[PDB]
Every structure is written in C-alpha cells, then in structure tokens.
Design a protein around this motif. Structure first.
Motif, short mmCIF file in Angstrom:
data_model
loop_
_atom_site.label_atom_id
_atom_site.label_comp_id
_atom_site.label_asym_id
_atom_site.label_seq_id
_atom_site.Cartn_x
_atom_site.Cartn_y
_atom_site.Cartn_z
N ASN A 57 -38.70 -52.71 39.47
CA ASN A 57 -39.32 -53.89 38.88
C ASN A 57 -39.30 -53.82 37.36
N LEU A 58 -39.42 -52.62 36.79
CA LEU A 58 -39.48 -52.48 35.33
C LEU A 58 -38.10 -52.60 34.70
N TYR A 85 -32.94 -63.16 36.74
CA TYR A 85 -33.33 -61.76 36.81
C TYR A 85 -34.41 -61.49 37.85
N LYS A 86 -35.16 -62.53 38.20
CA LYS A 86 -36.11 -62.43 39.31
C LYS A 86 -35.30 -62.40 40.62
N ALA A 131 -33.20 -59.30 44.80
CA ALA A 131 -32.04 -58.90 45.58
C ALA A 131 -31.97 -57.38 45.73
N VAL A 132 -32.10 -56.65 44.62
CA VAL A 132 -32.04 -55.19 44.70
C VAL A 132 -33.05 -54.68 45.72
N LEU A 160 -38.59 -61.00 51.09
CA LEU A 160 -37.68 -60.98 49.95
C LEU A 160 -36.61 -62.06 50.08
N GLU A 161 -36.01 -62.18 51.27
CA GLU A 161 -35.02 -63.24 51.46
C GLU A 161 -35.61 -64.61 51.13
N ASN A 162 -36.85 -64.85 51.56
CA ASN A 162 -37.48 -66.13 51.28
C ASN A 162 -37.72 -66.31 49.79
#
Lengths: 81, 85, 88, 81
Positions: free
Chosen positions: A16-17, D19-20, D25-26, D55-57
């Motif tokens: 996250n960072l 970037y969110k 995704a990561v 996360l997919e949502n």
C-alpha cells in the motif's frame, strides 16, 4: 502448529505504501508541471506550490512509514525463518 | 450565450478532495489513539514498542500535513471561488 | 497448552487488523458524504445538461463502492471475532 | 480562461485512480497466489477468498470512475474548446 499466513498483514501494508509513494510522486510532478504553465498568474500559482510542497512532505512521511514496515519485516524473520 | 460556468467541474473536484482530507484527518486521529493504546499494553523492553512509538510519530506528522493540505485546498477554492484567473 | 489468556497483552493480531477496520469505517463514512454531494449537485443541476450525466455517472459507482466497503468490513470484522475476542 | 486549474483537478483524480487500480491489482494477484497457500485447506483460506474477490469489485469500480473522468477530460480537446 504453524502460524498460517502470518507475515501477511504487514506485507500488504508495505505494498500500500510503495504505491501511495509513487502515486503522490506522479501527483507532485504534475503540480509542478501545472505551476510552470502558469506565468505571473493570479492567487492560484502560489496555492499550487503550497499543495506541491504538501505532497513532498506526504511522500517523506510515507517513505518512513515504509522503511519501518520494511525494516521490521526483516526483523521478525531474523533467526528461525 | 456566454455560458458563464466552466468552473462547474473544479468546484466539484475541490469539494470532494476536501471531503477526502476531512475524513482522512479524523481517521488518522483514531489510528493515533489506537497506537497510543497498544503502546500502553506493551513492555518497556519489547522492540515492537519502539516500532509503534515511531509509527505514532509518523502518524502525528501525517495528521499535520493533512491539516495543511486541507487548508490549502480550501484556500484554492475557498475564498478564491471569486473569479480569479 | 492451557496457561492463562495473555493474548490480550502483547500481540499484533489485535493490531494490524484493528487498523484496517478503522480504515474501512471512515472510508465508508467519507464515501457516504461524497455520494450525498453527488446527490446534491444532481438536484441543483439541469435535467438536460452535460454534467448531469457525468455526475449521474459518479454517484452510481459510489453506491457500489459503499456496498463493497461494508462487506469488506464484515469480513475483516469476522476475522476479528474469530481469533481474539473469541465471540466472548 | 482558467481551465488550466480544471484540467489539473481532473488529472489529479485520474492519477489517483490509475494507482489505486494498480495497487488493488497487486493485492489480488498476491491474494491469487497465496490463496493456493498449500492445499491444507486451513480456516484463513476462507477469509483470503472473500478479501481477494472484494478486490475485483474495487478494481472494476475504480476502472469505471476513471474512464468517466478520462471521458470528461477528453471533453476538452475538440468538441468543447
């Protein structure tokens, strides 16, 4: 009798960072860009450069948040790993 | 004709960014509170005490830079919702 | 084996998780306000304007975000009762 | 005039979303690998399942907020202006 994922909730806080850091870096570069396209503008050119600066500090404070989680994750997986 | 709006979208983009910082600030005040408490439920020796201490200090700067971020975003729109350039 | 329950003493199980739920609580409340904004500019808007569609195209997803964030909170919370705080 | 500040603010929402999405995704991938932990269908594999799928949502939802913002910023080169 093994901790299951264990070093997991600290793995994803590290991720996250990294991605908050590179994000506000991109945001920073785009504020300076904006600042430059403004010439002897109004009281927006000085507001932006404050915002730019705020981003730089937010980046420093997040980098040290990272370094800790990072350096800490090397600790707990010291001997016996 | 003229259609004197244009700024429509930027009152919008600033208000939501203001909302964001207001809730981040209050959120991090809780995180700071939580942090001070796990500190207290800890040893005077334990290394994780020192970790928590630092993550609290980093949380004290964060809140502060988000107060500043807020004031700014305010100022940009705040009064200077008064046709500047 | 069966010594007393000092799990409440010094552990980052009460931690890490705890922080994530605080994160969600306040993202939930933030996005509720953000949607309230979008409801408001959809009220003060035109019914034929170009912005009504975008604004009426942003509320929508904040509704789903709010829902997916509420579920995230139950999960991480369920992961709370499950380990320490063993439903009392 | 004064549309530099407006392209700025949209751009800042756009960069925050790229970037969110990338971060979210990561976290899915890493939750795609770890969810095949080591067969031993343990309890916290149930929790990683739900997490990963929210996360997919998140990702699909950010992807929609950002196309719009992108579509909106696109309303500037040609058509408008």
């Amino acid at each position: 009798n093994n901790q299951n994922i264990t070093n997991y909730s600290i793995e994803e806080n590290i991720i996250n960072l990294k991605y908050k850091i590179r994000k506000n870096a991109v945001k920073k570069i785009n504020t300076e860009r904006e600042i430059q396209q403004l010439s002897n503008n109004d009281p927006n050119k000085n507001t932006l450069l404050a915002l730019k600066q705020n981003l730089e500090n937010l980046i420093h404070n997040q980098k040290e948040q990272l370094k800790t989680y990072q350096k800490l994750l090397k600790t707990l997986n010291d001997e016996n790993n």
